[PDB]
Design a protein around this ligand. Structure first.
Ligand SMILES: NC(=[NH2+])NCCC[C@H](N)C(=O)O
Length: 569
């Protein structure tokens, strides 16, 4: 009870191949670029013709002939040397639109892999930065799509909660609490800088900080409780941003780097025992011929015993495979760490930590930039505060929403403004290929036309306005499709499952954003060309069915991007 449109069409094409004497040859079915050519294109004829050295044009026409009268495909036309353009039959479209609305068991079908997805994952010594913002948003949408397609999704927020820098942070916290028992740590950036001033200016403070590191590494209960105080504060700052954004990431999903500290020396010793890590001036180093320039050096323990980012991620991968029983690992991380994860994966495969049938994927994203192409900063050049950025998005959207509808009350406008403003923060990121650098732009992201969250949100509200106007209708009535844009919109709506499965496979949410924008703009063309309220009979009811499924698909698709809709704006 679903529609995998690609598979349904491929099945008919495969039968036509068999009827044409090329049974078992790959169909190589692809969607069409322009719907003026049809809905799908068969690309496999040239390859199939190679075996018998057959004439490919004649073979393509034989396949097309075998599709005459097909229930799914109403026309099959040869193009180029031996491509075949397929147009879906309107009765097939109508029946499956009807089913998507009325079959109570209809859904997006689901191979329940266990997927551990690592995202957001801020360093706790400072505030969350705009790179962590990208990871939070991109990872949250991927995680939503994976759940919706039936995977077992384990979110892990790999917070940076351990390291020598916490020595000066703990020492500075102690000083600040001695001078005020009501001490509030408002800004982690200012706190961090102030502690470094003390560490750089005061040798007695630096000695004190180094002693706290000793006690932290030693597990001193008293110093660990001070560490936990700081970590809990920093986590609360992150959680307030998560709450504002409306993520699916929860406190129970936190799994900080400190979790793996007892595994670091076992991993290092294991790699030495397997001959993968070797001694290099007292350090333990993994040399990888795979990353030669001379093989790349992947240091797993320093000369004096200290561990590294690489050490923690090796231990953590072992845990995610061996204890969480993950079949697929996704790391949603700034693109500048690509080499770290490539070396992590290669080392883990050689060590047996990552089995041959497990997948591990670096889900990289580009740098957030200002309009000058330089990394994103405030007008005065300072680090962007995420809480300020999100407040600004909501304030900006609230002003625009009041401009568009001056009859909104202040409280109604503010509620709409939150949905539009946060929605735009997410969509302006997610609608771009994650791997590109991203220029932040208030004017672009808050435009009510073009490819933006407000455009799609207001598109949903316009669908709801149609139903406020239409009166009684019957979603269960037989569906008829007679006009070109009726049929084009139906075919687009039936692609939803395939789009979502593509995002699950590739971890590119911008494919879903692109689909929703195409669907909304096509709905608008349909609405102009095929009057709904002026229609009568089956035409009226079928156009209302199309509008209802459009609304449902916009709402569901936006939800999987983390974006909400409103019945009224
Ligand atoms: N398993 C991981 N290494 N996840 C990413 C951690 C990102 C790191 N905390 C940073 O701020 O850059």
């Amino acid at each position: 009870h679903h529609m995998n449109l690609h598979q349904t069409v491929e099945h008919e094409a495969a039968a036509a191949f068999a009827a044409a004497g090329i049974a078992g040859s790959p169909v190589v079915l692809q969607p069409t670029k322009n719907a003026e050519h049809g809905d799908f294109q068969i690309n496999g004829v040239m390859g199939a013709a190679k075996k018998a050295k057959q004439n490919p044009r004649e073979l393509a026409q034989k396949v097309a002939d075998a599709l005459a009268g097909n229930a799914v495909i109403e026309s099959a036309e040869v193009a180029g040397p031996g491509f075949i353009n397929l147009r879906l039959r309107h009765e097939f479209l109508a029946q499956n639109i009807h089913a998507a609305l009325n079959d109570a068991r209809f859904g997006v079908a689901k191979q329940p892999q266990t997927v551990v997805i690592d995202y957001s994952s801020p360093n706790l010594a400072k505030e969350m930065h705009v790179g962590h913002l990208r990871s939070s948003i991109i990872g949250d949408s991927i995680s939503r799509v994976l759940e919706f397609t039936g995977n077992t999704v384990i979110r892990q927020n790999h917070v940076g909660d351990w390291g020598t820098q916490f020595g000066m942070l703990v020492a500075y916290l102690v000083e600040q609490q001695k001078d005020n028992a009501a001490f509030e740590l408002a800004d982690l950036e200012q706190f961090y800088r102030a502690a470094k001033v003390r560490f750089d200016e005061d040798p007695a403070f630096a000695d004190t900080a180094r002693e706290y590191v000793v006690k932290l590494q030693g597990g001193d209960e008293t110093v660990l409780a001070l560490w936990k105080q700081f970590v809990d504060i920093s986590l609360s700052h992150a959680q307030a941003v998560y709450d504002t954004l409306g993520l699916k990431l929860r406190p129970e999903d936190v799994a900080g780097e400190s979790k793996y500290n007892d595994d670091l020396q076992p991993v290092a010793d294991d790699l030495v025992q397997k001959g993968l890590a070797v001694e290099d001036d007292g350090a333990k180093v993994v040399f990888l011929d795979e990353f030669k320039n001379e093989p790349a050096a992947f240091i797993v323990q320093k000369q004096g015993g200290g561990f590294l980012y690489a050490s923690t991620d090796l231990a953590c991968l072992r845990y995610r495979i061996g204890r969480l029983k993950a079949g697929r690992l996704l790391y949603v991380v700034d693109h500048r760490q690509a080499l770290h994860f490539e070396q992590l994966f290669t080392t883990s495969r050689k060590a047996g930590y990552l089995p041959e049938d497990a997948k591990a994927e670096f889900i990289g994203f580009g740098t957030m930039m200002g309009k000058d192409g330089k990394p994103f900063k405030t007008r005065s050049g300072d680090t962007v505060k995420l809480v300020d950025l999100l407040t600004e998005a909501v304030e900006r959207a609230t002003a625009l929403v009041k401009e568009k509808n001056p009859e909104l009350g202040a409280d109604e406008a503010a509620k709409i403004g939150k949905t539009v403003g946060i929605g735009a923060v997410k969509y302006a990121d997610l609608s771009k290929n994650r791997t590109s650098d991203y220029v932040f732009d208030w004017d672009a992201m808050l435009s009510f036309e073009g490819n933006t969250a407000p455009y799609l949100q207001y598109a949903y509200t316009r669908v709801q306005s149609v139903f406020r106007k239409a009166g009684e209708w019957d979603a269960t009535a037989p569906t008829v499709l007679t006009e070109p844009l009726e049929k084009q919109l139906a075919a687009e709506l039936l692609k939803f499952e395939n789009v979502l499965q593509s995002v699950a496979d590739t971890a590119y949410p911008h494919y879903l954003a692109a689909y929703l924008y195409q669907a909304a703009t096509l709905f608008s063309r349909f609405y102009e060309a095929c009057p709904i309220l002026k229609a009568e009979g089956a035409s009226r009811n079928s156009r209302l069915q199309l509008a209802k499924l459009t609304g449902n698909t916009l709402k569901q698709g936006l939800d999987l991007l983390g974006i909400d809709v409103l019945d009224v704006m």
